[PDB]
Amino acid sequence: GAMVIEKEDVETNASNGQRVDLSSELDKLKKLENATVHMEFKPDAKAPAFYNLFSVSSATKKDEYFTMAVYNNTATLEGRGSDGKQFYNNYNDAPLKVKPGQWNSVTFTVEKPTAELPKGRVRLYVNGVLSRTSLRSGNFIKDMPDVTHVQIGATKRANNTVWGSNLQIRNLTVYNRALTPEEVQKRS
Numbered sequence: 065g066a067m068v069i070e071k072e073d074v075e076t077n078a079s080n081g082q083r084v085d086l087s088s089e090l091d092k093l094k095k096l097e098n099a100t101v102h103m104e105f106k107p108d109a110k111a112p113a114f115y116n117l118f119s120v121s122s123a124t125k126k127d128e129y130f131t132m133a134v135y136n137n138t139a140t141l142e143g144r145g146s147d148g149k150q151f152y153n154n155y156n157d158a159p160l161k162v163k164p165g166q167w168n169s170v171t172f173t174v175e176k177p178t179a180e181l182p183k184g185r186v187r188l189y190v191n192g193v194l195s196r197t198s199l200r201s202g203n204f205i206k207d208m209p210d211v212t213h214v215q216i217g218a219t220k221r222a223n224n225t226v227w228g229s230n231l232q233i234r235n236l237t238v239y240n241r242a243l244t245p246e247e248v249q250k251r252s
Contacts, residue, residue, distance in 0.1 A: 076217035082228030109165030160190035192252030
């Protein structure tokens with residue numbers, strides 16, 4: 065099967081620094097070329113305007129990280145390399161929003177460049193529905209030489225931990241292939 069990381073029925077809250085660490089799984093992400101990251105979660109009704117759902121980050125380089133996040137209820141995405149520069153098109157004004165204090169899913173896919181996708185392709189979905197496609201790059205963790213940490217919630221950047229919130233996580237699954245949009249609708 066294509067599933068490489070699976071976590072279920074965890075929570076971020078004041079007792080764990082609003083973080084669930086998954087860093088032992090980093091070696092599985094570092095060489096992925098096509099991937100899907102899917103998470104089913106219920107964010108706090110009182111969550112801050114910006115919070116992380118799932119990130120891969122670096123205790124050595126504060127500006128190099130990958131994050132699926134939620135920003136003013138908008139599901140968003142950022143990938144930044146060793147030079148701090150963006151991997152993908154902007155998602156901060158992408159259309160689809162999460163329902164605060166209610167169960168949602170968010171799914172990210174990445175496809176490396178091929179003859180059929182000459183720049184690669186990234187897609188982000190909310191509750192099974194495609195929000196936005198970006199053909200800027202198909203860059204992912206393999207393109208971040210300095211990453212050290214993987215987590216749900218509060219994210220290690222340099223020696224600080226940021227972007228925390230209270231989440232209940234029903235499922236977090238990572239696959240080593242990109243689910244098709246139809247597959248994502250069914251998965252959600």
